[model samples]
Target: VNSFSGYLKLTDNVYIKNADIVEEAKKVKPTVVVNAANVYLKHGGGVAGALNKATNNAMQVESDDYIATNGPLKVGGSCVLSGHNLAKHCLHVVGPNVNKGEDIQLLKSAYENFNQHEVLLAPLLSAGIFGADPIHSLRVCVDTVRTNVYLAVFDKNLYDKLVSSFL
Candidate 1:
């Protein structure tokens, strides 16, 4: 399967598996053990009902989900954000070509309301492309997020690792 499809399938199964595993793991004697997961373009949060509706409606173009050729332009708007409809808040952070200072400032601003425990899933290119040093890009992205905000990037490519390490 394509990466996006694989993401969706994995996302689909993760909840059940995670719940079972977490529950079982919790049963084990623990000394500050932590567990985590990643989120990608196709699916996350939940796949059915209102969560699905918000995912489909407000999140117009995910990093990997298919967009019709006739759909919205993907260049300028490069990020997707949503708050639970129940909460009535939303955030979108996007930049196809964010330079160093500007990218950090923008990311810092985007995360103003988020708290430490919230998980943020974002893109490498939004921070900076391969041409830019991955470490520098991650430095900016992490510096901006609230100290308490948990971060989840698409994957652990070199670019993604820098961000992961900071959190």
Candidate 2:
């Protein structure tokens, strides 16, 4: 099992960290793995792409079908994919692109949908190719989610910043 590199507690139940998301998923064995997808459910880049590849592209197929049947996911809207390769279920959320300042609120809304699960693995939503600031995105996620949240971070700089902030 891969150990978490660092951790920060946002609440009694919520926590954040810097580690390999997929590896953490395997180690934590969370009930849900939340994906940061676009409205079209395209997992062509960023965290979505990584998740799609890790799940043997099953996440992409499931997302496509979900959009086809239920229509495009709005910002902050979500769908579920069961029998995921890593986690028991996947929560696919359409986070906003970082066009102006709207992405932060949208990302926060996306995290708001995760309270139903006991354990959840989430990434830094909208902070990658979506172009939002990583630290701001992390704070938004922490403020929104109320359950046991395990965040996965990959950037060493951001990880250090988070670790220092907690200390």
Candidate 3:
């Protein structure tokens, strides 16, 4: 793997990079890409929506099938899906919605659902429309996962905030 100079190193393997989530997910091989999903498993808008579109909607189809049989997934729960074209696999996790007064435990559970995957291509879960602070989201993610976690943050403001926090 090539090195990215803009990365904010969290540990020996963990990093926060200002990169496109969809693009990185597509590039990484033998990895599990994480998606911040909704409880209904609808990948309409946000990281889930982008992941669905990037996978040529195979993700949406699988999500529909899963929801059809398994019903709506609870927040903090997950459903592992085929990546189709984006990655080797996708781990769909529904983080806590701060708009609904949820807390960090739900977000922690969201990250805890990972299998034995090595590289993690994850967004700042619950950091956008879900309303959780990116700093807290990043902290929970790094603290929970014990592998190389590459957090992709595209927003310049959010990226800098994360960088400054560590300095």
Question: Best TM-score goes to which candidate?
Answer: 3
The best-first sequence of candidates by TM-score reads: 3, 2, 1
Clash pairs for candidate 1: 116-148, 116-149
Candidate 3 Cα RMSD (Å): 2.2
Q: Model 2: per-residue lDDT, tens digit, 1-167?
A: 22333567766766777677776776766678888778888899777888788889888888788778988878877877773867888888777788644545777788788887767788877777877777777777667777777788777788888657645
Per-residue lDDT over 28-134 for candidate 3, one digit per residue giving the tens place of the 0 to 100 score: 64357889998888898888888888888888888898899989988888877887777768888899988888876898888777535677778888999989988
Better of 1 and 2 by TM-score: 2
**CA lDDT of every candidate:** 0.31, 0.76, 0.80
Candidate 1 residue-wise lDDT, 24-61, digit = tens: 22232212111110122333332212233433454434
Each candidate: how many clashes? 2, 0, 0
Q: Residue 20 in candidate 2 has what lDDT?
A: 73
Give the Cα-based TM-score of candidate 3 against the true structure.
0.90
Error at 3, model 1, angstroms:
25
